[PDB]
Amino acid sequence: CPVNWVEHQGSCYWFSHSGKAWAEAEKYCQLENAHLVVINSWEEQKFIVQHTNPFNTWIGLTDSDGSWKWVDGTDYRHNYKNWAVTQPDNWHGHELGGSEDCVEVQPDGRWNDDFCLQVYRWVCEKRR
């Protein structure tokens, strides 16, 4: 992996220590030829939260365009999910977005849809 990335199971990961809005975080990863982390499995989920706890951390999952999509094209419906109970609930807001449309990993690792303008830590992921 490149300098200051973490190699794990054929992927390289970069963990921020500061926050961006979801789309700014995804744009940052794309400029690193990466994407916001796409969590493909329980094993990857455990790896991610070991490193991100206890901050809400953006991952590459969003329903901004009308349904749940992973930023790298991974099929959402059929694949690994780790939603917290009663999530996603699409909570309606105003100041940080009209509705919760971007996914964060909670301290317990479970996923929550949140407002896309929340300034959270993020993780980039690309293949080694």
Epitope: N4, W5, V6, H17, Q50, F55, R121
Partner: antibody, heavy 118, light 108 residues
Framework: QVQLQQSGPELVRPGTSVKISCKAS????????MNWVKQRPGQGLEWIGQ????????HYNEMFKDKATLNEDTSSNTAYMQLSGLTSEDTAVYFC???????????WGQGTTLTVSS | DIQMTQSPASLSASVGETVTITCRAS??????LAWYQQKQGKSPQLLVY???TLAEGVPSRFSGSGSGTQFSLKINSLQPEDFGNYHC?????????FGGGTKLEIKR
């Protein structure tokens, strides 16, 4: 070359608190876990906890949750462990050691001897 | 919470002999097992991780094996720098735990 340099020996009284440092060089401090291990005289090793400096994420052995607090100074590549409410059972050598997730402790500091005694 | 059990507690051997020390985990840890060497008064040094992978610069005479709950470290044709204490440690889910150690002692 990878090197982990720990602070020098400590001799303190019970009920006090001590801070042990471990300065890392020769690798990217931010991308590895820093682990802390305890070894009482003549005994085996005990894992205290670990910190991931890039995020500050910490994981502790619950046996040490009240005893040890880990933190990091990113600007100086230094990991710290605070040991508090000290008693003679804290007398031991303490090591820092580097690891990656789900991997071994691949480089160790030289150890810091802590003696707690009235 | 995983208990690691090492045996024997002490093993006497001579240079050039082959020895095997063993480690048992109280539950499945797959291949997430490391072995350390520790010489008196010094810090441990990683020998083996992922149960069988030699760490950088470790001599090929060291051989780790096992998965699941039963593991072994074998030292083929021991050299004088091999005497000291050996420790196993699972590196599965935190908290890590260590075996109680095995002293490799000089036979006479």
């Amino acid at each position: 070359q990878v090197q982990l340099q720990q602070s020098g020996p400590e001799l303190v009284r019970p009920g006090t608190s001590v801070k042990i440092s471990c300065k890392a060089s020769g690798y990217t401090f931010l991308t590895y876990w820093m682990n802390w291990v305890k070894q009482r005289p003549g005994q085996g090793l005990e894992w205290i906890g670990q910190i991931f400096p890039a995020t500050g994420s910490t994981h502790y052995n619950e046996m040490f949750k009240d005893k040890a607090t880990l933190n990091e100074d990113t600007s100086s590549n230094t990991a710290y462990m605070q040991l508090s409410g000290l008693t003679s059972e804290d007398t031991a050598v303490y090591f820092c050691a580097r690891s990656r997730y789900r991997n071994g402790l691949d480089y160790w500091g030289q150890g810091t001897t802590l003696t707690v005694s009235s | 919470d995983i208990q690691m059990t090492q045996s024997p507690a002490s093993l006497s051997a001579s240079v050039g002999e082959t020895v095997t020390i063993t480690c048992r985990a109280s539950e499945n840890i797959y291949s997430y097992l490391a072995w350390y060497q520790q010489k008196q008064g010094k810090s441990p040094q990683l020998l083996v991780y992922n149960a069988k992978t030699l760490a950088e610069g470790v001599p090929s005479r060291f051989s780790g094996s096992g998965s699941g709950t039963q593991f072994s470290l074998k030292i083929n044709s021991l050299q004088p720098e091999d005497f000291g204490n050996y420790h196993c440690q699972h590196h599965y889910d935190t908290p890590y735990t260590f075996g109680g150690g095995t002293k490799l002692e000089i036979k006479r």
